[PDB]
């Protein structure tokens with residue numbers, strides 16, 4: 001019997017692109033006004049900085065919020081601001097980015113289904129990103145929410161899955177992870193010993209030899225799918 | 231005595247930022263027109279694909295045009311388009327980017343100075359980017375123009391500098407490189423045995439032990455600086 005069901009956030013519970021596009025635009029406009037010494041910055045330029053940081057410390061890849069604040073800092077300093085005002089503007093502009101990326105549209109299928117599942121399963125979140133369920137309508141459905149930045153390591157590494165299993169106190173064979181990414185969610189959870197349900201609403205083809213343990217196109221299929229393994 | 235002067239392009243012969251920003255926007259606009267299925271894509275989403283390609287083939291960093299075309303390809307195809315239409319769209323959208331990329335405003339100090347220098351020195355270009363002087367009114371001042379994409383290796387590696395010396399048929403002690411970047415241009419050229427002149431119009435501070443052989447804020451200072459080493 002399945003005791004634990006964990007879920008990926010971006011493109012599993014909502015479409016990721018729109019809220020991140022809006023967040024970028026918001027970050028952009030706030031800098032144009034509040035840091036007018038930085039000026040129109042090509043995507044190319046933040047990346048140059050980002051890549052230097054990742055070369056100096058590759059583990060930054062698992063700390064996406066810290067990484068972005070640091071990139072913003074270096075860009076600001078390098079455009080003329082005092083170390084102190086740069087840090088302070090970096091901090092403020094990031095908080096504007098982060099408020100923006102939380103303006104997501106949760107799929108309609110999500111709340112009704114989480115409510116059903118919570119009657120019978122312990123539920124958790126495992127995300128590489130910086131969407132925080134407490135900021136959304138969702139904190140109360142989940143026993144816990146894990147993110148790579150707090151762990152210092154992200155999916156598909158075993159660590160985040162093992163930590164979920166620890167917090168629930170269940171063995172891998174009693175757990176299912178649900179997500180949209182073939183490598184991060186599916187292969188990741190399976191290599192940690194769990195079952196994995198692939199969320200594929202657009203009906204994409206699967207191309208790895210090990211199959212998802214199930215595939216769905218709508219989250220409200222979860223209760224029937226999980227009952228298979230009861 | 232000085233026979234060869236080589237010059238970096240971006241941020242030494244013109245401001246880097248504006249033409250590239252315009253290019254990104256033109257690229258953005260043309261794709262909303264001819265590739266409606268891709269839709270508004272977060273900068274973050276291109277970085278992931280870019281990062282993926284740089285993983286399978288790290289030498290992609292020296293092929294910036296080819297790299298962008300491949301990233302455009304994968305985003306279009308992974309947006310639904312067939313391998314055929316993706317590739318034609320990638321290729322076409324890239325040419326639009328590249329055209330916009332060449333709408334630079336050459337510093338007024340440049341042409342008058344190149345004309346003077348050309349009378350007594352061999353002039354060359356050494357760049358990691360995809361600005362092509364042949365597409366600009368500047369082509370006639372230069373004997374050669376090396377880019378990292380054609381050499382498969384970029385500054386600060388000594389290879390592009392050593393190639394320049396071979397094209398001009400002179401020894402390193404007979405050569406000077408002019409550039410804005412402390413590592414790519416200055417340290418790079420000096421480690422290859424050349425003299426290096428730091429283009430620093432904004433009056434930034436220099437913080438490496440080894441000094442640029444000279445520092446200027448206006449390209450028209452070159453004739454007098456070069457005369458020091460005659």
Ligand SMILES: [Mg+2]
Nearest residue numbers: 008009010011
């Ligand atoms: Mg996801």
Ligand SMILES: [Mg+2]
Nearest residue numbers: 238240241410
């Ligand atoms: Mg440059």
